[PDB]
């Protein structure tokens, strides 16, 4: 289900790629904010979009449709340019909200909903006809809509930050379990409110994974890891189960890490 756009249409959509509509340029290329009006494409509702200038694969991407995957609306191939048109995620990436000092906009139930939605999207990608695996799955791959519903971005386009599973750093072999490790790191970020690696913290606290691991089996000392801004919003039972899910996902042994569908099944009851 993909619309084909010309560059002329995308100039209308992005106000000729105006400097004001540029929102950033990561590893996969620049992204511009835009708008499709009701008349822009037959059968396409008016909406805000994100246009990536990428730096037959698109037909497969168009099949990866799921409530927790950012929708690919269409594409444009012209004069050696390859552009992708996605639904615009109104609240942007999870790290903008989570790495705030307090992250008071993300109460416990919202963080659980984000964790569950991201797990559902990753399980869908891993269970696809051709398994879709990230090279660098991290917090910024989770984008948020106006309801803080989580949807995964940059799927199918493919360790200093701390999201790379240790065996992947050493070998570079892409496996679904490497994504599960990164998911576990993000879950620890959601539980703790802390970035995965923060060199300004004391040496033993720099790595969120290395520092939190001994505490994830200690229910009476789990409060040291939990975000202080969440105090009073969670039961110890729910916090310890979520911590145990994260603990399993960041297991040094990849065979210990769960399938993402099992992560969904373990986290959904906490809501
Ligand atoms: N569909 C979308 N809706 C809203 N914002 C988006 C969308 N896709 C990308 N963005 C935002 O556009 C900016 C550039 O995205 P990009 O993915 O290139 O950079 P990044 O995610 O910060 O870096 P990297 O992907 O290399 O880790 C980021 O702020 C990103 O969150
Ligand atoms: C703009 C009109 O010529 C249609 C463009 C196709 C490629 O969708």
Numbering used by the authors: 4 to 58, 70 to 172, 189 to 301
What does the original paper state about this entry?
We identified ScRIPK, a member of the RLCK VII subfamily, by a screen for sugarcane orthologs of Arabidopsis RIPK and rice GUDK. Thus, ScRIPK is a member of the RLCK VII subfamily localized in the plasma membrane. Furthermore, bacterial growth was measured to determine the bacterial proliferation inside plants, showing that transgenic plants exhibited significantly higher bacterial proliferation than that in wild-type plants at 3 days. These results suggest that ScRIPK plays role in regulating drought tolerance and disease defense in Arabidopsis. Like the typical structure of protein kinases, ScRIPK-KD contains a small N-lobe, composed of five β-sheets and an α-helix, and a large C-lobe, composed of six helices, an activation loop, and a catalytic loop.
In this study, the catalytic base K124–Arginine (K124R) mutation was performed and the mutant protein ScRIPK-KD K124R was purified and crystallized with ATP. The alignment of overall structure between wild type and K124R mutant protein showed no significant conformation changes (root mean square deviation (RMSD) is 1.090 Å comparing 220 corresponding Cα atoms) except for the C-helix and activation loop. The C-helix was outward, away from the active center, and the activation loop had no electron density map. In addition, the position of ATP in protein structure of wild type and K124R mutant, and the crucial residues of ATP binding pocket were partially different. In the ScRIPK-KD K124R mutant structure, Y169 and E170–M172 formed a deep cavity to clamp the adenine group of ATP. Other residues, including G98, G99, and K124, may contribute to the stabilization of the nucleotide through hydrogen bonds. The catalytic spine was also completed by the adenine base of ATP like the wild type. To explore the conformation of this mutant protein, we analyzed whether there was the salt bridge between R124 and E140 and the results showed that there was no salt bridge between them. We also measured the distance of D1 and D2, and dihedral angles of the X-D-F residues, which revealed that the ScRIPK-KD K124R mutant was classified into DFGin group and BLAplus cluster. Furthermore, the regulation spine was analyzed, which was not assembled.
